[PDB]
Write a protein that binds this ligand. Structure first.
Ligand code: HEM
Ligand SMILES: [C-]#N
Length: 249
């Protein structure tokens, strides 16, 4: 909604198509889908709607942005992608990283998130401190996703489901371990696990737990735990919106 996508050349679109295929093979082989999804989200989640600053515009590769404590470990992701990115000099880094996030979801068995090219690489990284804080709750989630990014309550719960793949690392955030028993499979298990309680070996952040006690978020958690198809639909809508923050209006 509200989007007017820019025109790109036929050669640009050719490169998008080829890069999508190469990303599938690379991400599957390297087992790095969750890291690439986190990279795409950290690139995009810095958007502030009031000022029109931050967002998915290639700035995460800058040494100054990688230095941010919230971005611990994402230097690995940027380095992993550099050889492949160099095969597609016509593409912006901004588009490349968002394409990698879309592919991460697809190769782990998730929905096909629509992708539109044309993001420009911008000079100035956003200020530090805009990304969500795992130790806070529902008010904080609405401040970051709602007041800054401009996303809905539905988007917040669906996007939290991205944690269905991957794990935390004590050397990165400090939290440790996977949210699910199948951390390379994109499914609704994040929500099933959140409901069943604190299982041995699995992770729940305070920000995950905040979904369970909020009057708006909880019915969404229940819906996604019962209906994977509904989760996939809402997730695809939310990821597309996140990947396009500040882009094409
Ligand atoms: C809702 C607010 C969010 C909070 C509080 C949060 C917090 C965190 C934290 C603390 C980690 C662990 C980092 C580490 O130690 O390696 C993490 C990892 C991850 N996050 Fe989030 N995040 C949020 C939103 C998102 C969103 C919107 C997405 C994408 C849709 C996402 C995708 C991921 C993925 C895939 C990982 C696993 C990374 C890996 O396996 O290396 N997160 N998140
Ligand atoms: C997660 N960032």
């Amino acid at each position: 909604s509200g989007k007017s996508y820019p025109t790109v050349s036929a050669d640009y679109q050719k490169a998008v198509e080829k890069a999508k295929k190469k990303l599938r093979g690379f991400i599957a082989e390297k087992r790095c889908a969750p890291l690439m999804l986190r990279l795409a989200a950290h690139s995009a989640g810095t958007f502030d709607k009031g000022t029109k600053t931050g967002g998915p515009f290639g700035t995460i590769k800058h040494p100054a942005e990688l230095a941010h404590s919230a971005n611990n470990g994402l230097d690995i992701a940027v380095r992993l992608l550099e050889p492949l990115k160099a095969e597609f000099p016509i593409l912006s880094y901004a588009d490349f990283y968002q394409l990698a996030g879309v592919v991460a979801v697809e190769v782990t068995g998730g929905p096909e998130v629509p992708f539109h090219p044309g993001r420009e690489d911008k000079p100035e990284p956003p200020p530090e401190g805009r990304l969500p804080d795992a130790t806070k709750g529902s008010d904080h989630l609405r401040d970051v996703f709602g007041k800054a990014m401009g996303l809905t309550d539905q988007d917040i719960v669906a996007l939290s489901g991205g944690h269905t793949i991957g794990a935390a690392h004590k050397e990165r955030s400090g939290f440790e371990g996977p949210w699910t028993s199948n951390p390379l499979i994109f499914d609704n298990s994040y929500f099933t696990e959140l409901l069943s309680g604190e299982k041995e070996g699995l992770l729940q952040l305070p920000s995950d737990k905040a979904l369970l006690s909020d009057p708006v978020f909880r019915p969404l958690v229940d819906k996604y735990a019962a209906d994977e198809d509904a989760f996939f639909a809402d997730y695809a809508e939310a990821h597309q919106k996140l990947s396009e923050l500040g882009f094409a209006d």
